[PDB]
Amino acid sequence: GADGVGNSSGNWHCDSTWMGDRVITTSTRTWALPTYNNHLYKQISNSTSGGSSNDNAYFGYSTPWGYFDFNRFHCHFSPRDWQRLINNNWGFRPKRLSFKLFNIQVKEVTQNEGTKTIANNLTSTIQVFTDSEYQLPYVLGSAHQGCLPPFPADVFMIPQYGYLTLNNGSQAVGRSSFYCLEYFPSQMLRTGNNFQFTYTFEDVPFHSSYAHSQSLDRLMNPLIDQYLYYLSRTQTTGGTTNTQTLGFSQGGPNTMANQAKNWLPGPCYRQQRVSKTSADNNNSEYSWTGATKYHLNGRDSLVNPGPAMASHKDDEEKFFPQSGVLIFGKQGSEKTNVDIEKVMITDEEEIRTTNPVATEQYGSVSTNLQRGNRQAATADVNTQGVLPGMVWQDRDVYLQGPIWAKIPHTDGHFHPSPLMGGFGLKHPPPQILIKNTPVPADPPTTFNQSKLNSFITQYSTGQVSVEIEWELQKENSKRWNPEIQYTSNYYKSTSVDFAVNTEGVYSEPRPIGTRYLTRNL
Amino acid sequence: GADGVGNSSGNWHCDSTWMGDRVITTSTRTWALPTYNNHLYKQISNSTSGGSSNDNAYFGYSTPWGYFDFNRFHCHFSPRDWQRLINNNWGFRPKRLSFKLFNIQVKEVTQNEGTKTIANNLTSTIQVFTDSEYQLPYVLGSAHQGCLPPFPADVFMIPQYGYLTLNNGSQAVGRSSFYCLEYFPSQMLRTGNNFQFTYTFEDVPFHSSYAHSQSLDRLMNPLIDQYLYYLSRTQTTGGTTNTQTLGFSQGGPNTMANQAKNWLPGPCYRQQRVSKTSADNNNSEYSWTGATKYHLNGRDSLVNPGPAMASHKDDEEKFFPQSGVLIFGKQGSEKTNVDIEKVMITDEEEIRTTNPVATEQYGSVSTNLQRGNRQAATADVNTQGVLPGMVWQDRDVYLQGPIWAKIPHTDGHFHPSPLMGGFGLKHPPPQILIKNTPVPADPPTTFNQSKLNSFITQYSTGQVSVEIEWELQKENSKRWNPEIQYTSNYYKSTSVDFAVNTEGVYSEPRPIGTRYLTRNL
Amino acid sequence: GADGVGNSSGNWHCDSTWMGDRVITTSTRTWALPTYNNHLYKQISNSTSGGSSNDNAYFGYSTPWGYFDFNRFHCHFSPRDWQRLINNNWGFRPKRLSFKLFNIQVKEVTQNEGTKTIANNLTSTIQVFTDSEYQLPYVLGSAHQGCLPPFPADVFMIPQYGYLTLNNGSQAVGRSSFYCLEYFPSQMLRTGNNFQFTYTFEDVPFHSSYAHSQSLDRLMNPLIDQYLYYLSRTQTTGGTTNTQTLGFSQGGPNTMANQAKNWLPGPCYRQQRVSKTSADNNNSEYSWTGATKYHLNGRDSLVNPGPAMASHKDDEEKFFPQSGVLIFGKQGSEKTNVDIEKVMITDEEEIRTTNPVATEQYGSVSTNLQRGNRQAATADVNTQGVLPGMVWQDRDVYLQGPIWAKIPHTDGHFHPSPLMGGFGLKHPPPQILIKNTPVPADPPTTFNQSKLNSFITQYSTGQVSVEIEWELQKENSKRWNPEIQYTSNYYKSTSVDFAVNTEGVYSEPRPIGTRYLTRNL
Ligand SMILES: [Mg+2]
Ligand SMILES: [Mg+2]
Ligand SMILES: [Mg+2]
Ligand SMILES: [Mg+2]
Ligand SMILES: [Mg+2]
Ligand SMILES: [Mg+2]
Ligand SMILES: [Mg+2]
Ligand SMILES: [Mg+2]
Ligand SMILES: [Mg+2]
C-alpha cells in the first residue's frame, strides 16, 4: 500500500476467531524505533563490554537496525484465549502468519537552549526487509526481551539487532563473517506507506497439550500374570547353610516392577536438585560448580533448560532442577540476583509418566561379572542417550514462553524440538529488520571526502499487526470422571489475576502451561 | 470515506423533516476528546475514590477511551420540534439511526517556558469502534452527563468510559471480569478520514404521548344500574336493639364506588410524601431513613424513580414522592445539596387515571375472619405486585430525559419498560468508543524492555452527526371541545424561554413531558 | 421390530456425540419389572397408609403398571460430559428424544419345597404404551426416585405408577376421577419384540448456564455523575437550631446507592435462615412452624424450593434458606432425619446479581405520610410479587437434578419455569407405562363367574435406551482474564471422584451446577 499524509494506512486489529479445528489470533501494537548506534555498524566483543572469563568471550557486530519479535505465546493469546486452548484441545500447531506495518510516523527532534521540540518529518523514510532466504544470523529463538507486549495497550520499543560470529577470546578468526544489512533490498516507507508480509509454517508435529493418565511402568493388566519368567531367586531360603540356586517366577499383580516390558523411559542428562526453601540446601556457591554443562571448543555452557525431564518425583514439589526448568520473572523483576519471590519457576512434573526425573539417575547398570568370589556390582546412570524402545514427551509450552526456534543448519539434528519448548522449524518466521534512514544535517559548502557524521535526530513510530492461524487437535475424552481444567480462583482478591492494578500496570501472576487434559499412554 | 489534509470529510446537518407518520431528526455537534488516564487502564474501587459505606462500595476499571452519548431527547429535538410532536401525536417510537464522525483534527500540545503552543499533528490517529455484539458493560441508560448538547452551537467534551464488575466491599471476586477495549477491532482515522455507522431499532411499543380522559373507576354508564348485587348492609337500621342482617343492593349512579368492575389499578411500591414547602415536612433527616429501597446482596439502593405511579392526588400539587419522580437541574445547577429553586421536579399526575398515587396505599385487604366475637379487620397495602386484570401507564418521557435503556440479559424481565422512562431494548444503539492513539515521544537510543511512558500531548476534535427516524401515531381526536396543548406563554419576559441570554448561555427553563392530548380508556 | 427367541432385538448404545451447536446423549440400561399390586388397581388414601394430619391427606389409586423415568440430567450426561457442557456453553436446551425397549425377557418363578426356580416363559407378554395425549395424571416432574441410574453398569427396578385425585380428608369427592390404564391401546411384546418411540421438544428458552459478572445496582459508568437529582437533605446541618430544608444532589461515583436506575431485582417470598453449624441456630422445633408455606383449600404446603432467590449474601456461605434450595442425598443416605453430613445442600449464590437473597427482605417501603408532628416510617417487604422493570434469573440445573416438568393445564401460568429448575413444557416427554400381562394359573374344570385370582408368578427384564439431542449456545467470552471452570481437584485421594469404590459402588460426591462461565448484564 501507498497513499497521502492525511490518510490512515491501516486499522486496529486485535481479536481471536475460533472455528472448527482452527483459531486465528490477531494482535496490534504501537512501537517506537530510535536511531541505533548513531547509524553505524560496530565491532563488539567481551573486551568492548568489559571482559572476565573465556566461557563468556565473544565477537560480533552491533548494527543500526532494529527487529520485530513476536516469538512468545502471549503476543497472540490473551489469557482467556489461552485458557480456551488448553482446556479443550489435545494439541495445536501454527499454520500461517500475516504481518503488517502501518501508520508510520517519522519524527524529528530538535535540542536547543534546554527546549524539547518534536516535529513531524513528513518526507523521511524507514527501511524494512525480511531475511526470507535466512542469509543473516538468526537471533529469534534465543529468548530475548523486545517482544510485542502481552497487554494490547502497552507501547514498546523495538530491540536492536546484533549478531555473533566466531571468536578466539575477544578476537576474530578467518572463518568470522561480517554482514552488512544495507547489502539487502529493503522497502523504503514514508508516512503514507505501509508494509505487509505473509508466511506459511512448514508441517511440524502438534504440541502435546495433555498429560498422560498412565505411567510407562504401569501399562499391564493388573489382574493377570505374565507367561514370561524372570530370575527371582539366586540363593536358597531357610536352614543354616544358604547355597546358590536359580529360581524363576512369572510377574504378576504384586510384582509389576519385575514384569517384562516393551519400552524404556526417555533420555537423561542429570541436574542438581535445589530446594525452594534455602535452609534445606548446602552452604556453598554451587550455581556454577554444581551446574550441568556442555563443553564446546574449550568453553562451558550451562545446559539450560536441557532435555525434557520431570522436575520432581511424587510429594517433592519444593525441589527443582538447578537449570532444568524455565524460570520467568514476575512483573517489574530486575536483571540480577533477585530473590525466589521475584521469579516464577515452571514445573514439568506431568511428564514423569514417561520421562526420568531431572535430578535422579536414569537407572542402574551392571559393571562386573559376578562369580563365587565376586559379588554383583551396579552403578548409577546419570547420562543416558537414546536407546531403541525409548519414549518421551517434549517440554511444555507456556503462555509467556517461546513459540519457535530455528533448527541449526547441520548434517544431523536428532528430534529437533527446541529445548526451551516449542516448535522447531528449518524455515522459521523470518527476521523482520527495520531502521530509520539517516537524514544528513547541512553539509559544508566546500567539498570534503569524509563520510557525513552530522544527522538530524529522528525516531519513528507506528503500528504493527501480527495474525497467526493455528490448527487444533480437539479433546475427545472417553473418561467417565471430570478432568483437570485451568481455572481462575473463585475467592475475593484486591486485584483480579491477569489484569491491571490501580496504577495501570498489567501483570501475568503465574506461568500457564498447556497440560491440563489427560490421555492414556 | 478516505481523502486528503485540505479536503473537508463532511458537512453540517442539523434539521428535522416531518413526513406522513415519520419525523427524521438530525443534529450535528463539535466535540473535543482529551487523552484519558495518560493512555492507561486503571483498577478503581470505593477505596481508590475515598470509601465510606458498603451501600456505595464498588470495583471496576477506568479506561483511556471516551464514548458518545446521545441518549436524551434534546440531542435530537429542538423545543419547537418537541412541541410539534406532543401537540399532534398520540405516540412515537424510534426506527433507525445513522451516526457519522468527520472533520477529524488531531492536535499536539507543547508546554515549554510557560508558552502554550497548539499545532496540528497531521499524521496522528484516533480509534473508533462500536460494541455491536454487546461484549462490553453498557453504561448508556444510566442517565449520565456527557451527552450531545441541546443547543447546536455548544461544543462538548466526550466523557470517559469506565465500568463496573462484581465486588465484595472494595475487593474483586473470582466472577469479576476485566475487559481490554484494544482487544477489539477499531478503525484508525487520520485528519482526512471519516466514520459512519447505521442501526435499526427493534420493534418496541409506541410511547403513549397522551393522558386519559377517563379514570378506571369511572367507566360505567352513569344513568343505568347494574344487574349485579353487592353486600350493602350487615346490621339492622332503626329501633333500640340492632342485630345481624344481610342486605344486598345493585350499584348504580350514586354508588359507583360499590359497582362491580373488571379491572384493577396498576402495581404499587410506596414512596414517602415530601412537600415542596419545607415548613410542612418533619424536622429530621429522612432522605435515606424514610427512603423506599431495594435490597440486593446485603446493600440497599434507592428505588429511584421506581414503578410508574402518579405524583399526587387532586389539589395536592405541592407534594412529590421522595424518589418517585425525575428531577432535573436548572441551567448551571451544582452537584451537591442545591436548593429546590435550582431543580425541576417532574409531575406524573396524568397517570392517576389508572396508576396508584405513589405516596398512598394501593388499597385495603381483609386480615381476619369476622364472627360474633371478632370484628372485620383490614390493612393497608403498601406494596402490590401485578395481579390479573391490572392495567397501567408507563412513566412519561421528557425533552431533557432519556430515550432508551438496555434490557438486562436475564431469564426473566417483566414489562421491560425502563423505569426512568423510555424505550427498553434488548439490542440498543451500541456504545461508540473513541480514543486518541498514543504517540510515543523520543525513545532512548539503547534498548530498554519497559513499556514506554513518555508520549506527545495530544487531543482531538471533530464533528459528530446523529440522525434518527421516528415513527408517529397521529392524533385522531373525535372530542368536540378543544384539547390541552403545550404553549409558550403570551406575556412580556426579559428573555424568551428556550433561548440564549445576554451572555450566550442557553437554558431549558422547565421539563416538557409528552402527555397533553387525551383519549378515552 | 418383530423377530424370533434366539435373535437379539437391539444393541447397547451408550455415548455422547458433540457436533457444531448440538450434543447427542445416549444411555442404555438394564431394568427389571415385577408384577405390581398382584395385577390389581387399588384405592389408596392417607387412612390406607396410616393417617396423621389434614396437610398430608390424599386420595388416589395404585395401579399394576410401572413407568420409565429419565427426568434427571445424570441419566444422559456422564460427569465428564457435564463438565464439557458447563465449561464451554452459555446455554442449552433439549430438542428431540428417541426411546427404545428391547431384549425383553419374561421370566416365570416357581416357589415349591423352599426351592427357587426361575425359568424363561417364552410365550408371555409385557404391555407398553405412551400417554401421548396427556390423558393420565403426570407424575414425572415430582422429583421421584426410580430414574435410569447415573452409572451405566447399574441395573434398576421400574417404579410403580399411582396417582392422586381430589380428596376431602381420606375421602373422594364427586369431581374425583378414576383411570383405568387398560382402557388404553398398548403394544404387547413377547421376547422377540421391541418398542420404539420418538418425541420432539417444543421451543423452550435456553437454560442460562452462566453467572453474571455485573450486579443490577452497578450498571453505571463509575467515572461520571448523573444529570438527574435525588433528595439528599431534609434538615439543615450546622448551628444549634436544626430546621427543615430541601437539598438535592446528583448521584455519582461515591453515591451509587442513590443513583436513578431503570430496573428492579427479581420477586421475593422470604425464607428462614438456617446455619449449617447447629450451635448458631435457635433451640426449638421450627422445621414446620418457621417454614415458608402456601395455603391451598385449607392445607399448608411447604414452599420448596420456591422462587429463585440467592442462597446467601457475601461471606455468609454457612447459611442456607430453610426450604429454598435443592438438597440431594450422598450415596446410600437414608430416608429419615439424616445428619447434614449425609446431604448435599445446593448453593444459588451466583444469582445474587439480580435476584434478592432468599432470607432477607426485598426492600423497604414507606407506610405513612410524614409531616411536622409525624416522622417518616418504613416497613420491610418480605413478599414481593412481580413489578414492571423487574429482572431475574431462574434456578440453576444440576447434574443430579430434574430436567423438565409439565406446565399445569391452566388459564394462567406466569413465567412457567418449574421451580425445582429446568424446562417447563406444556407437552413434555410422555409417560411410558409398562406392565407384565397377567398369566392365569390352571382354572377350575367347572365354570365359575368370579374373576381369576391365581396367576403364574412372573417378572420381566430387558434393556432401555434413551437418546436426547440438545442444542447449545456456545460461550463467546471477550473478557481478557481467565474464567472460572469446573475442575476435578489435582491432589492425591483414596478414591477418584465420580467413580466406583473398592466394593463397586458408584457415587456422585457433590452437586454440579451449570453456572461457571460469566457474562455482563
Ligand atoms: Mg512478551
Ligand atoms: Mg510439581
Ligand atoms: Mg549449516
Ligand atoms: Mg443533553
Ligand atoms: Mg401535579
Ligand atoms: Mg445475562
Ligand atoms: Mg438418577
Ligand atoms: Mg455460597
Ligand atoms: Mg386444566
Author numbering:
A (entry chain A), B (entry chain A), C (entry chain A): 217 to 737
Sentences from the paper on this structure:
AAV is a small single-stranded DNA parvovirus that attracted attention, because it infected humans without causing recognizable disease. AAV-DJ is a recombinant chimeric mix of natural serotypes 2, 8 and 9, selected from a randomized library for liver tropism and immune evasion. Like the natural type-species, AAV-2, it attaches to extracellular heparanoids and became a model system in our laboratory for studying the glycan interactions. Alternate splicing and start codons result in three viral proteins in ~1:1:10 ratio of VP1:VP2:VP3, where VP1 and VP2 are N-terminally extended, the larger VP1 including a phospholipase A2 domain implicated on entry in endosomal escape.
Here we report an analysis, now complete at 1.56 Å resolution. By FSC0.143 gold standard, the resolution is estimated to be 1.56 Å. Inspection of the map clearly showed the presence of a first hydration shell of solvent water molecules bound to many of the polar protein groups. In the absence of cross-validation methods, modeling was conservative, adding solvent molecules only where peaks in the map exceeded 1.8 σ, totaling 265 per protein subunit or an average of one water per two amino acids. Presumptive divalent ions could also be seen, coordinated by histidine ring nitrogens. Here, at 1.56 Å, the AAV-DJ structure is refined with a full complement of hydrogens, most of which are clearly defined in the map. The 249 atoms within the nine strands, βA–βG, of the core subunit jellyroll approximate this, with mean B, = 3.3 Å2. However, the quality varies from excellent in the β-barrel (CC = 0.88 for grid points within 2 Å of the 249 atoms) to marginal, the marginal regions includingthe 24 disordered loop residues with breaks in backbone continuity that are only breached in the unsharpened map. For seven of thirteen histidines in an AAV-DJ VP3, the map indicates which nitrogen(s) of a histidine side chain are protonated; two others show the entire imidazole ring, but without distinctive hydrogens at Nε or Nδ; while four exhibit disorder that precludes imidazole proton assignment with confidence. Thus, we are observing, at 1.56 Å resolution, the effects of local environmental pKa perturbations of the nitrogen atoms of half of the histidines.
